[PDB]
């Protein structure tokens, strides 16, 4: 992997093959995706995709560990200060790109 | 020292003279551990 592509893939957190993340689009980020264009499949997900991505494969970064989101208290203890207290609030903050 | 002392009094004197949805908001109020303490007593 070339040095510039390798850095951009690390900023997106796609350090491994078939890794997935959500990216909110704008001039800054859309031009990053152009650099890594040969290395990524991307597009616009729908409400169902956000649902199933977060329910089946949703893991939280809690104290720098990969903890499955098996309880709402996991989301509330970390994102509660932003009023995000359940998986549904999490899906709404992602899907609608909240503040 | 004289200028700093003088301005502190001048500064202090001026200061001393100068001095989503109704349902979801209601529930978010009740679920608040502190504020909804009197409301949760009401429901029970």
């Amino acid at each position: 992997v070339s040095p510039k592509v390798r850095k951009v893939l690390q900023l997106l957190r796609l350090r491994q093959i078939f890794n997935g993340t959500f990216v909110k689009l704008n001039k800054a980020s859309i031009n990053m995706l152009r650099i890594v264009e040969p290395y990524i499949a991307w597009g616009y997900p729908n409400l169902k995709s956000v649902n199933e991505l977060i329910y089946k494969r949703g893991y939280g970064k809690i104290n720098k560990k990969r903890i499955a989101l098996t309880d709402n208290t996991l989301i509330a203890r970390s994102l509660g200060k932003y009023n995000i207290i359940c998986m549904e609030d999490l899906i709404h903050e992602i899907y609608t790109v909240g503040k | 020292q004289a200028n700093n002392a003088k301005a502190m009094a001048a500064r202090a004197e001026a200061i001393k003279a100068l001095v989503v949805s109704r349902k979801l908001h209601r529930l978010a109020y009740i679920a608040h551990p502190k504020l909804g303490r009197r409301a949760r007593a009401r429901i029970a």
Binding site: I85, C86, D89 | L24, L27, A31, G36, R40, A44
Partner: peptide, 28 residues
């Protein structure tokens, strides 16, 4: 007297359950 102390414990356990109950309604 422990009877006085026990009620304090129970009213706290009831309080936490009501706070948990209202939190479930909010996310609902």
């Amino acid at each position: 007297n422990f009877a006085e102390l026990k009620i304090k414990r129970l009213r706290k356990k009831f309080a936490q359950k009501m706070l948990r109950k209202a939190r479930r309604k909010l996310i609902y």
